[PDB]
Amino acid sequence: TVNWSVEDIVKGINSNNLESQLQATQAARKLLSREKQPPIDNIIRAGLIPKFVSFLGKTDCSPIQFESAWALTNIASGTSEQTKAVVDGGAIPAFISLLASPHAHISEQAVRALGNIAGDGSAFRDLVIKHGAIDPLLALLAVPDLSTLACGYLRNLTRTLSNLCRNKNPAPPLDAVEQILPTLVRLLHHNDPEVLADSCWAISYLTDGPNERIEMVVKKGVVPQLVKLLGATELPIVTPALRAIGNIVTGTDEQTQKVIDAGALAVFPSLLTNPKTNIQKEATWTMSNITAGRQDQIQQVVNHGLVPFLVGVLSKADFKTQKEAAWAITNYTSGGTVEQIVYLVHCGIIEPLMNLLSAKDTKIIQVILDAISNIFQAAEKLGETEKLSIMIEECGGLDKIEALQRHENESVYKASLNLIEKYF
Ligand SMILES: [Cl-]
């Protein structure tokens, strides 16, 4: 069945010989598994999807169920229009019936096919849910110990469940999320790196929304496990774990506190120096939504030794990361006590802050300028306003601020002039 033409496949599928149809379907499946440019569109144009879908129901002939399920899975893993062709052929209810197949390799294909369809987008996600996929999917995981399941099979179930958690506008139905979450919590404790990665992605999707979505997740007790995975060695795990934690700290101060209470801040020395740029970037963004919290939460950042790491990120990092660092400092200086803001200067924030004021980005400049203002405000409460003026002179900051009086932006000009006057 290697190297058939689409014309030969169609000839075999149009014979009314179940074994000839089986041969041709397998030929189609191998064509569609090809690495180089599989002829998905040619198979679709030939009108083969509805025949493949009808073969999903031939319970008398499990091999042709398998080959047609795999063929359709491959098509559904392509472009959105390709995925739509599969859905338009009636594949969704047929695949959901195949979840009850006694043949593990056949129910597995149906799991994968439904994951590919649900992962296309919110509409297909919700259509898969409306056809009732969740109950039969969760039943396949209703075992006392996940470790008795075949490794590849458990990974496909995890991947498919995370795709049912994925995408927004809208987010998934609340009742669907509640139904899935307990099984997701269990997968999040399973010791396979790929199951862990995909479960973390699932949690990152569910926490990417309003505070009530976050609370659903936080109430399940998963934050300690997320923090544990935040320290994993595998970057495919750390990345979604860090995303989930970062989402959770965009919520309320009480939700942020659960992350702190679980020990998250002790991982940030590594995260804020991580060789992977996006980890450093997302770790610094997370920090900024922690320094937007309460003064006792700022104080935890201090106690964990993280101000020097923020100074470090400001001084040298990818620019996008330095931008988040700037944000973290301004949030820190808006909400911090006077003692806390003084500590920040004593750690060296001023010189790296000044040096970023020469960046060809207008947003960061207004963020840095705001932070400088909030620091002076604290300097006033101590009268050491004079001494701060000097520091900013001694490192080239006054040169930088003077020129910003004359900037394309008006909010930039307003703030810079308002400072060169009020303090110099
Ligand atoms: Cl674990």
d(CA 416, CA 317) in angstroms, rounded, equals 25
| CA within 13 Å, CB half, 169 | 0
How far away, in angstroms, is 402 Cα from ligand 1 center?
Answer: 54
Residue type for position 220: K
How far away, in angstroms, is 303 Cα from ligand 1 center?
Answer: 28
How far away, in angstroms, is 196 Cα from ligand 1 center?
Answer: 8
> Resolution of this entry in Å?
2.2
Q: Which CA distances in Å does 420 have to 38, 301, 309, 385?
A: 65, 31, 29, 13
Q: Which CA distances in Å does 146 have to 137, 192, 307?
A: 14, 10, 42
Question: What tokens appear for 265 in the block?
Answer: 């801040």
How far away, in angstroms, is 267 Cα from ligand 1 center?
Answer: 16
Long-range residue pairs from 152-158, CB within 8 A, at least 24 positions apart, any chain:
152/108, 153/104, 153/108, 153/111, 154/190, 154/192, 154/195, 155/192, 155/194, 155/195, 155/198, 156/108, 156/111, 156/112, 156/115, 157/111, 158/187, 158/194, 158/195, 158/198, 158/199, 158/202
How far away, in angstroms, is 256 Cα from ligand 1 center?
Answer: 22
How far away, in angstroms, is 240 Cα from ligand 1 center?
Answer: 15
Look at residues 339, 362, 351, 360 and name the one whose alpha carbon lies nearest to residue 397. Answer: 351
Terminal alpha carbon distance of the chain: 83
Look at residues 204, 208, 167, 168 and name the one whose alpha carbon lies nearest to residue 184. Answer: 204
Residue type for position 84: K
From the CB of residue 275, how many other CB atoms can be counted at a distance below 10 Å?
7
How far away, in angstroms, is 252 Cα from ligand 1 center?
Answer: 27
DSSP class of residue 61? -
d(CA 272, CA 245) in angstroms, rounded, equals 14
Look at residues 241, 240, 304 and name the one whose alpha carbon lies nearest to residue 269. Answer: 304
How far away, in angstroms, is 190 Cα from ligand 1 center?
Answer: 6
Question: What tokens appear for 365 in the block?
Answer: 């400049």
Q: Which CA distances in Å does 149 have to 87, 145, 146, 155, 284?
A: 29, 8, 6, 10, 39
Instruction: Assign 361 to helix, strand or coil.
Output: coil
d(CA 345, CA 336) in angstroms, rounded, equals 13
d(CA 26, CA 29) in angstroms, rounded, equals 5
How far away, in angstroms, is 276 Cα from ligand 1 center?
Answer: 22
d(CA 228, CA 383) in angstroms, rounded, equals 45
d(CA 242, CA 219) in angstroms, rounded, equals 18
Look at residues 105, 30, 32, 38 and name the one whose alpha carbon lies nearest to residue 65. Answer: 105
How far away, in angstroms, is 145 Cα from ligand 1 center?
Answer: 14
Domains of the chain: 1-424 (1.25.10.10)
